[PDB]
Amino acid sequence: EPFLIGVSGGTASGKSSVCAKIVQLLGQNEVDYRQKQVVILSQDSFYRVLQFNFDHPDAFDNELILKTLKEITEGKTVQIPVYDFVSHSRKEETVTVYPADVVLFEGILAFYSQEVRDLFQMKLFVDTDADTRLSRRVLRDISERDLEQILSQYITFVKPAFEEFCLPTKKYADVIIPRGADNLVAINLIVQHIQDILNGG
Amino acid sequence: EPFLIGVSGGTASGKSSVCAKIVQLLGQNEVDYRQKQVVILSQDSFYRVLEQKAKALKGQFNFDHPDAFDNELILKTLKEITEGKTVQIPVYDFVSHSRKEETVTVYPADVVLFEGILAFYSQEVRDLFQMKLFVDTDADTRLSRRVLRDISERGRDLEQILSQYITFVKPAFEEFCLPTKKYADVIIPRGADNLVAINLIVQHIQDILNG
Amino acid sequence: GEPFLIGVSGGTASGKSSVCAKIVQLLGQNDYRQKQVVILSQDSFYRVLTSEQKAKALKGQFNFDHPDAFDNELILKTLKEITEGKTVQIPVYDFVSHSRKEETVTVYPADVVLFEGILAFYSQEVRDLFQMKLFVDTDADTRLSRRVLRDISERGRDLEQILSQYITFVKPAFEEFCLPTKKYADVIIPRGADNLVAINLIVQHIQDILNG
Amino acid sequence: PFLIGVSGGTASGKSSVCAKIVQLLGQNEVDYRQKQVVILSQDSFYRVLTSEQKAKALKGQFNFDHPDAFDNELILKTLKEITEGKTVQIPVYDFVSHSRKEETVTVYPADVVLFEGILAFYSQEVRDLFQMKLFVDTDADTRLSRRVLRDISERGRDLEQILSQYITFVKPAFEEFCLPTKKYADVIIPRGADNLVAINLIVQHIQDILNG
Ligand SMILES: [N-]=[N+]=N[C@@H]1[C@H](O)[C@@H](CO)O[C@H]1n1ccc(=O)[nH]c1=O
DSSP states (O other), X not given: OXXXXXXXXXXXXXXXXXXXHHHHHTTTTTSOSSSOSEEEEEGGGGBOXXXXXXXXXXXBOHHHHHHHHHHHHTTOOEEEEEEETTTXXXXXXXXXXXXXXXXXXXXXXXXXSHHHHTTOSEEEEEOOOHHHHHHHXXXXXXXXXXXXXXXXXXXXXXXXXXXXXXXXXXXXXXXXXXXXXXXXXXXXXXXXXXXXXXXXX | OOEEEEEEESTTSSHHXXXXXXXXXXXXXXXXXXXXXXXXXXXXXXXXXXXXXXXXXXXXXXXXXXXXXXXXHHHHHHHHHHTTOOEEXXXXXXXXXXXXXXXEEEOOOSEEEEEOTTTTTSHHHHTTOSEEEEEOOOHHHHXXXXXXXXXXXXXXXXXXXHHHIIIIIHHHIIIIIGGGGGGOSEEESSOTTOHHHHHHHHHHHHHHHHO | OOOXXXXXXXXXXXXXXXXXXXXXXXXXXXXXTTOXXXXXXXXXXXXXXXXXXXXXXXXXXXXXXXXXXXXXXXXXXXXXXXXXXXXXXXXXXXTTTTEEEEEEEEEOOOSEEEEEOTXXXXXXXXXXXXXXXXXXXXXXXXXXXXXXXXXXXXIOOOHHHHHHHIIIIIHHHIIIIIGGGGGGOSEEEESGGGOHHHHHHHHHHHHHHHHO | OEEEEEEOSTTSSHHHHHHHHHHHTTTTTSXXXXXXXXXXXXXXXXXXXOHHHHHHHHTTOOOTTSGGGBOHHHHHHHHHHHHTTOOEEEOOEETTTTEEOSOOEEEOOXXXXXXXXXXXXXXXXXXXXOSEEEEEEOOHHHHHHHHHHHHHXXXXXXXXXXXXXXXXXXXXXXXXXXXXXXXXXXXXXXXXXXXXXXXXXXXXXXHHHHTO
C-alpha cells in the first residue's frame, strides 16, 4: 500500500523544488533507483502524443496518469515516458520506477481529475502569489525564447488555464504551503511525516 | 525548551476546534492538568481590563481590535513559558466584561498551542512561535459558523450578531488578521474537519514529545 | 437603432436588483406601452421542473442557482429578438407549480434594456449581446448577512436550513459559475445599491442614450 | 471644478486611461489656457529627500511606492486650491537628484480635474476632495507583465534588477497601502485603457458635466 501524495499549484510556485528538497532531505538521492523508497512523478512527463495551449487539461494523457498511478498502488513496476520541454517530443526511452513506499505526484492539474484526486491520501497545494510566480517563470524560461513571447504565452495560455482549471482545485487540498521551497518549516514538516511513514510509527 | 506553535485564522475558522482536537488525539485529556505535555492558550483570555468604555450595549466596543488585547502581557506570558517557568493565565467572562481574580495555573509544558485571531499581529510574539499555522476558512463559511455558534452558545439574537459582525468583526479581520496570513508556515484550508491536516500536526508533536 | 442592452450580474444579495430598480426610478420610467427603459430578470426564465425535480425542490435539494435551472435557449432567443427591435413575451414563472403560467408579460421594444441575473454573463452567446456589462461586487460575507436577514424577515425561513442550503448550493454555484464571469464585466460597481455615485453615473449615461 | 481620483496598482492603466479619456474629448486639440479637462499625476508630488533618505535612495533601499515618499501636505493644499478655482503651480520632480526643479507647471482652473496616483485614496483628507473615485483593477501578474516590458524599453536596466525591486518594494507597498484603499472607490474600471466601454462611460459623463 504505497502512500501517494499529490502536490499541486501554479507554475513556478515551487512544486518541483519542494518535492526535490523532500526527497533530498530523506536521502533518496543517494540510494539506487531500485531501492528508492520515495519517488517523484511529474505531470509534464505525461504529455499527450504530439499557438497551442499546453496548460490545458486536454494536453495531458489523463488515462496514462490514472493507469500508472493505479498500477503504482498495486505494487507493480511502471515505466514513465520522458518529455523535453523545448522540442515537445516524447522520446522512446522510458524511466523505470520500481515499487516505492511514498510517491510524490507534482502537477499544475494534479487535483483536476476526480479519479486522480481520490488516489492521494494527502493532498498538498503550493500557493504562491501570481506575480511572484510570474517573476520566477520569466527568469526560468529565458535561462532554460524571446522575452516578449514568454509574456505573450503566459498571458494568453498559462494565466487563463491556472484560473480556470488549477485555482478551483485548491479547495481539494489538505495542506497549503504558502511560499514553496523557501518554506523550510513546511518542508521539514512533510519530511518528518514521510520519514515517520517509513518507520511505521 | 518548549515548542511554541502559533495558530491564527479568522473568527469561527476552527482554531479552537483544531487545537482541542490536537490535544485530544494526543490523549492529554486523560493526563492530569499538572502533567499535561501539550497545553492550549487562547487569546480571548488576554483581553484588556474592563473600564475603557462602560457602554457596550448602548454603543458597542469593537473587541476584535488589537488595542483591546494585552499585547504586553501576551509577550510576557509567552516569554516566561519559553524560559520554562510556570505562568498564571487570567480568566475572563465575555458577558461580564471583567477580569476574574482567579487565575489558571499552567505548568511548563513541552508543546504550547496559542490560538488567536491576531496571534501573528505583533512581531515580538511572531518570532516566539517556532511553527506558525493559519486556518484559512472562507469568509461566508466563517460567518455561517459564527452565527450558529453565537445563537446556541450565547443568548444573542441574530440582528445584533450580524450588526456586530459587519461593523467590527469583518473590518478588523481584513485590516489586522488577513495581512498576517503571510507569516504562516502551514495553512489549514477548512479547519476541524480537515482530518489529514490535523493528523499531520499530531504526528509532528508526538515526534517532538519522544525527543 | 438597436436597443442598448446592459447586462448586470453579481452574486445573490449583492444589490443588482436594487441597483437596476434605483436606475429606472431615478429615470422616472416606472407606462409599459411607452416606457423607454425596462428591467429583465433572469428569475423569469426558470425552467419547468419535471416530476422528479419538483419532489427534490420540496425536500430543499434543488439548486436554483445552477445554470441547468435556467432556460438559456429562451434567454438567448428573447435577448436576440430584443436587439432586433421586436416585442417579446416573457414568462411569469409560477413557483408553486414550478411551471410557466398561461399569462405572460409583454415587453415592447425599449431604447435601453437591463438584464439582471446571477449567471447573466455565463453563456457566451448571451454575453456578446450586451453592449455594456455591469458586475455588482459585494463581499461574500456581506452578501450572506444580507440574504440571511432577507430570508428570515421577508420570507420567514429557518436559519439552519438557510445556512445549510447556502454552503451546499448557493456558495458553490457562485464560486463555480458566477465569479468566473466577473472578468467579462466592463464596469464593476461595488457595495451595491448604496453606491449612489456609480448609480448616478449609469443613470446619466442612459439619459444621454435617450437624448442622443 | 469636478475632481476625479484615479487609483490602482502600477501598470494597471491609470495613466493610459486618463490619457485616453482626455483624448476622446477635444482636450488634446484644445488650447492650454482653455483646457477644461486636465490630468494631474501623483508622481509630480514626490517629497524632496533628506540627505539620510537620499543616502538610502542611492543604495537602492528607498521604497518610492510608500506613502512617506509623497508630499501629502502639498497634494492636499494644491488640490484644495484647485477646488477653490485658483490657478495652481505643480512641481517638476527631478528623479536623479530627488529634488524639485525651479521650473513649475501652471495649471489653470479647469472644469474637470483628473488626479491619478497609486495612493490617491490613501489620505482621508485627499479622498474627500474627489467627487468621483475610480480604481483601475488589473491582475497583479498582468501588471507585472506590463511593467517588465515597459521598464526594459523605457529605461536601460536589466531584467533581474527589475524583478528584484518589484518583489522587494513595489509588491509589498501595493498590498499594504494601495490595495486597502480599493474599498473607497465608487467605480472600478478593469483591465485599464483596453476597456473601451468604461472609457466612453467616463468620457460621456465628463461631456455632460462640461455642458451643465
Ligand atoms: N421567487 N423567488 N425568488 C427566489 C430567489 O430570488 C431565487 C434565488 O436565485 O430563486 C427563487 N427561490 C429560491 C429558493 C427557493 O427555495 N425558492 C425560490 O423561489
